[PDB]
């Protein structure tokens, strides 16, 4: 499950160097927007719609169905998880994928 892992921290790689192109506040506003959607504080819908407010870009559709392919992809790994501790995947892929974010680590 690890691999869409790896494919949507490319995908935050290219929303914030996308706002930053513009130039204002931009890539740190759809930079809020994508974190709202992986921790699971914003409707998909509304995801979608505040990032383009934002950019005001025509935009390749292929974003929603994106992260809808990736419920059904990370979910058998994840929703194992998520068993164990008795708790909805939605709030497990919130403090897990926001604890991989972090830049606490020295190493």
């Known amino acids: 499950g690890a691999r869409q892992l790896s ?4 995908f935050l790689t290219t929303l914030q160097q996308y706002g930053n192109d ?7 506003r ?4 994508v974190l709202g959607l992986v921790n699971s504080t914003l409707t998909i819908e509304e995801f979608h719609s505040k990032l383009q407010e934002a950019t005001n870009f025509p935009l390749r559709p ?3 169905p994106f992260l809808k392919a990736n ?3 990370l979910q058998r790994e994840l ?3 998520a068993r164990l501790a008795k708790q909805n995947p ?3 892929l919130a403090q897990h994928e926001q604890l991989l974010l972090d830049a606490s680590t020295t190493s």
């Open 7 to 10: 494919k949507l921290k490319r």
């Open 30 to 33: 759809v930079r809020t927007l």
């Open 62 to 64: 292929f974003v929603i």
């Open 71 to 73: 419920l059904p992809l």
């Open 90 to 92: 939605a709030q497990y």
């Open 22 to 28: 513009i130039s204002p506040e931009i890539g740190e």
């Open 79 to 81: 929703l194992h998880c």
